Amino acid sequence: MELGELLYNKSEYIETASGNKVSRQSVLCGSQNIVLNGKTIVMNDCIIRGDLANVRVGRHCVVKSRSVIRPPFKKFSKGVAFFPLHIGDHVFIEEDCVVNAAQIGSYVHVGKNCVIGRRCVLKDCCKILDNTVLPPETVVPPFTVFSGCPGLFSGELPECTQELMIDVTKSYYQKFLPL
Amino acid sequence: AFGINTDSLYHELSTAGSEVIGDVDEGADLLGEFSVRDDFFGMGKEVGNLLLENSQLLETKNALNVVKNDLIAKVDQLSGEQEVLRGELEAAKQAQRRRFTRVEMARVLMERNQYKERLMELQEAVRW
Amino acid sequence: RDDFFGMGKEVGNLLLENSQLLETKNALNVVKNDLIAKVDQLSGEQEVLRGELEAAKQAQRRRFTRVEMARVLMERNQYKERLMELQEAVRW
Amino acid sequence: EKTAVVIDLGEAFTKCGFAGETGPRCIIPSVIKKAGMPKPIKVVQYNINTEELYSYLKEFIHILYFRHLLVNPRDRRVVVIESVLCPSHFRETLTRVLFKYFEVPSVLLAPSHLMALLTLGINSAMVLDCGYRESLVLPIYEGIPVLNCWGALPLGGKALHKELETQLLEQCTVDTGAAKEQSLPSVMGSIPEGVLEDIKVRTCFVSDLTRGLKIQAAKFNIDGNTERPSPPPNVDYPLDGEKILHVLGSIRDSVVEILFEQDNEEKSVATLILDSLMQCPIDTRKQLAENLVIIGGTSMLPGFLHRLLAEIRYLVEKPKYKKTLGTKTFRIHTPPAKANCVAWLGGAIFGALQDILGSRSVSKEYYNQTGRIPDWCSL
Amino acid sequence: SVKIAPGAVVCVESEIRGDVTIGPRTVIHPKARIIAEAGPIVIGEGNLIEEQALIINAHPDNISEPKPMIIGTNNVFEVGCYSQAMKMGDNNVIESKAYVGRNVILTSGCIIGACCNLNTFEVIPENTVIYGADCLRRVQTERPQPQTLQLDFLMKILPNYHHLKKTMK
Amino acid sequence: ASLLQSERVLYLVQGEKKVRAPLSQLYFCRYCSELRSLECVSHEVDSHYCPSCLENMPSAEAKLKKNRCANCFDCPGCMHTLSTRATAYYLACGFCRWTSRDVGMADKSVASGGWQEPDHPHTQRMNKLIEYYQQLAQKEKVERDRKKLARRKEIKIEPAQAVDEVEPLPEDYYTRPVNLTEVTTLQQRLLQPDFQPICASQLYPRHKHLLIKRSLRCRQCEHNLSKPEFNPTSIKFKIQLVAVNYIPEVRIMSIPNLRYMKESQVLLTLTNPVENLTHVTLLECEEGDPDDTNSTAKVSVPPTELVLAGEPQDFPDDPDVVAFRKANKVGVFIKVTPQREEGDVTVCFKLKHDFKNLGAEVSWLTQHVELSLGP
Ligand SMILES: Nc1ncnc2c1ncn2[C@@H]1O[C@H](COP(=O)(O)OP(=O)(O)OP(=O)(O)O)[C@@H](O)[C@H]1O
Ligand SMILES: [Zn+2]
Ligand SMILES: [Zn+2]
Ligand SMILES: [Zn+2]
């Protein structure tokens, strides 16, 4: 019931000095601004927009395949820019997502094939289910399941998400063996 | 490795010089790098760990602001029990305007925080 | 020259911000010590008023929140006059 | 003293909130969603087994007490509005979850009919609950519910949903939108209840008396050569995006005529008012028929009260009621809330009387060392 | 066959195939697959194509005949969207991960929302907002919305991070 | 939490009702040495916080404001928090494009203090009836205590006037097409229970509902099982007592085929720094109600010591019994004779261990673990 031996090709992924595993087909535009500190995984064709802002993810972050993360756009008082989104530690972004969020918190599972709108704030230890749409400028609370097609509150998480999400993403990093 | 790595992704993927150019990036145009002067790079990294030194002081400030607001929840409960016990012992022995001002101040503080919070994210952006 | 002077401005600005965060930390640690000493003397007053009762049986909120909020506004102030100069130091 | 909590467990919609207010804090459908079930289940079910109803009611008042009410359970008295002749094991299981699980101070089992009467200041009226399942009439006379003259017919919202499903599968005309834009009759098996009640509250309406009698005569075709009046235009209602169902205009004014179908038993909605009135004592009839209140969530169909008053004034000239209830004046009260929450508004009026609420109710220590709820039946 | 007017920043990582006519002030993001199969594409003034806006002119392949597409003025396509429409108006947004089917005509100023698979043989009326994956649910908007200032920001930041497409005069 | 399919292992709680719960939804009391499920334990209310602006606000303020936030509004179209917008200020939604000018209210010159709900029109009659019936409840109050001791200013309200002719159906319902955008559905109609409008031009937006930080109290000994922190956006609790910080958990990774013999592997994980475990009980002989069993496990082992860190591994190897010994994690092989039914192979077996009560570390608890396979 925990995660199995997912196998990857040894020539496909580049294992860096700190422990990051990035695929070659993951296009990531403007690599001088993207900061990937811990032992993160960026899967195949995961489009990372390090143009227009700086993307800083946490320690054991799994970005799955064909999912797009990008900064949002905000009309300023004086002069416009793009907000630097800062993904927290131990964040499990699933496949085929669109992320336009600003300040995703730590220890969040983000479910499969979902759209998070512009300047949406994710707080710590929350959860977004599958096939949801979040509207722009929404804040989700801690220990909260947000689901549904307008992105409503649906249910309540267990209180031991902090003792579980570390074990889930560390077992997913340790079950990543090359072929 | 260590707990954090602020070496971006270009300096982590520039070990071979071919994969960052071909696959994961365009990689061109800004081919001119920045000489990491023995002291320019070190005293540039001196800002980069001191901003984390500011961030840990910020989250410990947010830790002790939980404790102060929790202590004032237990001051007034013992005060409300103290007044009820004082009235029982005594019987055994025998501003809207200000509140509105408070509300206004609260709204203003909220606005200030909203401006602050962001502006520190834009100052986080232009530090690099 | 210009980049060195520009980020040496930033070292000094972050050093003053790290100074005022520690001064606010000292100023709230003093009032946390005052609150725990005051709730200890109120616990002592409550056991005295429980025991002597057993032997005999044998706009404040407004003002307070207001002071605190004035303090908060002052803090935000010593910040939005500094970071407007930091934001024009982006602008050059 | 803290304020009381007033809960009415309806069949379709549960009405809930605090006592003394001018309206309910929530109106929700009375369903719960378990893990793995693709459909939500109705929480109120009569003559089913005990522990399943206990678990469903435990999850539903836990959802009700920590999502809409935001308040502790062990602090305040509960006024539980139930129908007259509600089933006794359902009342026993509802008191068992409200006393053994939540551990409240005192529930008060309250009839909906008498605190439908309580919101006007009057003490004697004819009262009619047009609920989801029943259409239950009662006389209340000087605070006494007259139980000898009750009358119930199963002409609630469930019969309207079954009739709407029957005429929609009789004349189904959907457009799929996948080069199937012509008439495609009944490509789905059963229409769900939420879409059926959305068609019923968004499109359907209630015709007049003289139009509805000609609609019944044209459906009868007893020498009526196309003597129907002009129907309303057809309504294109959507289901799940691409499916467009053309609801015909005959359905929108002919699906509600089963409330006023005669069919030689004289059992319609307006006949049980007179059938309850003919068993009344003769000193009560004038100021029982002068005060009619109509409660229940069916009653805010548009034109329903005017059709009911015209059907009463048409049925008074029948010779079965001309000798007994012939020369009567029928008037309808206006309750100060909407007709879904009149029984709730009187329950919230009754819950604010804190001096008598501890004495007119069942205490939890009384439930602890008796275990038996009072009823109107024998003991 | 790629006729790009001057002023329009088009990056090189976007897969552009077939006869297209790119207008004066457009912005094309990376991984933007615009493929012309049966006829040409005409994209007008300032339509900011953003990320995977998959635009396909294979009408006879899926089911003379030139049969082009006309795309108007400030038509922003968001991330992961799927557009297939032989006539399209001006000043109108479609949102992220939406599907537009083949025989949909669009006039000015309409919102197609997130994840609404719409496929009907129907001209969309003036300023109708289709929302939700479940159903369609039109609501009228009284005001045609503007979008200029993000792409006048986006002219100045894209060519120092990306290479540029070829441009005729 | 849901990435591992956490309903595959279930634990039998012991109380008045014996339910099976996953270990993420279980709490362990310390004074009574017994784990407690969520359905057999008591719930409390700590604080009220708005989900849009995450700020705490007290209980009497929530009773005044009728469980509604003072600043945030939910739209009538979807259920999404509206946002203010300048032209001078008006409310608009992000998911749908519902603005504040659809219902027809004017733009407020200030952004927060100008929007308020209309009052109920029949609150004067409701207050007059409440102040009449409280006087009548006092007049019924003074007789029953007088009857009890015998055993041992008037206000009248004008009532409601009934009408002999109610307002009929309008003639524009006949011979006019309805507009489904203009009329409202029942779900957004019943979110305004004071007045339920037919048209969408009379459906004003409501304020945002609040949520509850929940404390949990054990029903045998009244102590806090999980009290959260009062300030929102907090992850740390004031006191937590959760089962995944006290009890050992079993987990599966190796499911072979269902050809009427299997040798599967589990892992036992650890929370204590040093503990002992034993899976030696084979769920007795039809005892303890193992009614969900559909297979037969051998599962025979001696007690295994387990060590967490922040000659026990070299000498007792036993590779058919103990598969691997990492840090705080020991794999154990179980021999299953599965598929006794048509499908849905489940195995019930008991788990004995040791816990520190706080001698006190020799408190031995038996845990009935029912685990399910994919069959
Ligand atoms: N505004 C409305 N207009 C028309 N019909 C409505 C309206 N609101 C609810 N209904 C219908 O009224 C019925 C529910 O009535 P009501 O709420 O009085 O029942 P209940 O209290 O749940 O049930 P019961 O009295 O049988 O316990 C359903 O058929 C529902 O679709
Ligand atoms: Zn709020
Ligand atoms: Zn909305
Ligand atoms: Zn206990």
Author numbering:
A (entry chain W): 1 to 179
B (entry chain X): 374 to 467, 518 to 551
C (entry chain x): 410 to 467, 518 to 551
D (entry chain J): 12 to 390
E (entry chain U): 8 to 70, 77 to 182
F (entry chain Y): 2 to 88, 106 to 170, 219 to 376, 388 to 435, 448 to 464
Paper excerpt:
Cytoplasmic dynein is a microtubule motor vital for cellular organization and division. It functions as a ~4 MDa complex containing its cofactor dynactin and a cargo-specific coiled-coil adaptor. The formation of dynein-dynactin-adaptor (DDA) complexes is a key regulatory step in dynein activation. Here, we determine the cryo-electron microscopy structure of dynein-dynactin on microtubules with LIS1 and the lysosomal adaptor JIP3.
